Coordinates of C-alpha atoms in Angstrom, one line a residue:
X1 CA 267.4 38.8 136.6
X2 CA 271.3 40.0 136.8
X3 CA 272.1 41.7 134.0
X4 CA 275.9 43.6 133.4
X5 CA 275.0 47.6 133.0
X6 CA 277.2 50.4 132.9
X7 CA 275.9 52.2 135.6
X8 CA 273.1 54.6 133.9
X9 CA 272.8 56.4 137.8
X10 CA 274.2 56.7 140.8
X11 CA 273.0 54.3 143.2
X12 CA 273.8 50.2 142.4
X13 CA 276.7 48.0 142.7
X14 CA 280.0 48.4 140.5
X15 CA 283.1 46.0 140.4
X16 CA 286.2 47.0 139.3
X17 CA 289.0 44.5 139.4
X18 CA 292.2 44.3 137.1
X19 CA 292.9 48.1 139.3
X20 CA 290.7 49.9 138.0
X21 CA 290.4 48.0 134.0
X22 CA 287.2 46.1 134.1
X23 CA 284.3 47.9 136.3
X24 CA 281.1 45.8 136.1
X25 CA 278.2 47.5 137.3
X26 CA 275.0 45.5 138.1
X27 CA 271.3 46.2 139.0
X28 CA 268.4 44.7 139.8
X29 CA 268.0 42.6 142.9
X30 CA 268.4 39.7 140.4
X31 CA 271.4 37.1 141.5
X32 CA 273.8 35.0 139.0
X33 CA 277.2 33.6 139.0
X34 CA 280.0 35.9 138.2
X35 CA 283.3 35.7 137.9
X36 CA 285.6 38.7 139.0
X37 CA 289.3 38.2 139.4
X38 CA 291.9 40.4 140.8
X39 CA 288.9 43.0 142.9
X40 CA 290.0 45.9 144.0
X41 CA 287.2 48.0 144.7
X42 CA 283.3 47.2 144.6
X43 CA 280.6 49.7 145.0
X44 CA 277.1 49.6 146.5
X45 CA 274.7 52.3 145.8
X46 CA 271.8 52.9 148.4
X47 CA 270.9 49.2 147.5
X48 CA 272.2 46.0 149.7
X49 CA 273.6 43.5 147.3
X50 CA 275.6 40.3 148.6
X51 CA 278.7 39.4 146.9
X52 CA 279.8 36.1 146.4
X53 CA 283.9 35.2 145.5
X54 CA 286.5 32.8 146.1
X55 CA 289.4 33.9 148.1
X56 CA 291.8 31.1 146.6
X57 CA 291.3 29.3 143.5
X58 CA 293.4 26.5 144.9
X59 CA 291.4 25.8 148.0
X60 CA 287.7 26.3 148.5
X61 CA 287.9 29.6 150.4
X62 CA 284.6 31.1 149.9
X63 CA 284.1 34.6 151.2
X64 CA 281.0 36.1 151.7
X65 CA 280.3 40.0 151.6
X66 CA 277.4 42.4 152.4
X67 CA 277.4 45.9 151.2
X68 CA 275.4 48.6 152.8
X69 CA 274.0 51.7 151.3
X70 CA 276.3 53.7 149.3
X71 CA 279.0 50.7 150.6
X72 CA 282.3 50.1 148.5
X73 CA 285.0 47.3 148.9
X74 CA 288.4 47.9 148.8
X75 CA 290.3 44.6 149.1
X76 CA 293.6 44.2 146.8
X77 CA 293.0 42.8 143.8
X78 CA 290.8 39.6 144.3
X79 CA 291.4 36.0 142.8
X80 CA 287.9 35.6 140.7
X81 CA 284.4 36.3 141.4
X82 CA 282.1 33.3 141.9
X83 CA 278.4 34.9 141.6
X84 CA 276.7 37.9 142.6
X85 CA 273.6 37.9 144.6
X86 CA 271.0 41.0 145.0
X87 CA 268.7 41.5 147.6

């Protein structure tokens, strides 16, 4: 029930890899694979979403991320994006 929106508010979760090129902002507690390479900020409205991405491509190095209320991420330009899952 994940569908790719372009933020119509101020309070969901928004990826934007590729510095700042490709934001991707999702709603919905819905949950589907995604792929996201290169992240270097995510956001997180007042809404807990989980995010799911590979660290290396090359090795199985899952990573798993909560965001709080009105949480970002800030990382340095992630690999890909495996999935996206919404509580």
């Amino acid at each position: 029930m994940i569908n790719r929106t372009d933020c119509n508010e101020n309070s969901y979760l928004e990826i934007h890899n590729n510095e700042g090129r490709d934001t991707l902002c999702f709603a919905n507690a819905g949950t589907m694979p995604v792929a996201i390479y290169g992240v270097n900020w995510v956001e997180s409205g007042n809404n807990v979403v989980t995010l799911q991405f590979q660290r290396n491509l090359s090795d199985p190095r899952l990573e798993t991320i909560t965001l709080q209320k009105w949480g970002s991420w800030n990382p340095g330009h992630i690999h890909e994006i495996l999935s996206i899952r919404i509580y």
